[PDB]
Amino acid sequence: SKEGSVAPKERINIKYIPATGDAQAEAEVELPLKTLVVGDFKGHAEQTPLEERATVTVDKNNFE
């Protein structure tokens, strides 16, 4: 779930909300500037069609 939960209603209902009450506030992840480097990277043509071969995530930590 995402709204939390409450107890069944009693004489004294106490629940905690995000009490900022920030109307007109929505959450977004800072979108990555995903650069798609496309170039000749192997010594041959592959018979596999272009829709089926996959992208390879590269960072500094797994380039080797």
Partner: peptide, 11 residues
């Protein structure tokens, strides 16, 4: 006084 609801929030 016969019942109340409370909502708390840090800010």
């Amino acid at each position: 006084y016969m019942g109340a609801n409370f909502e708390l929030s840090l800010v």
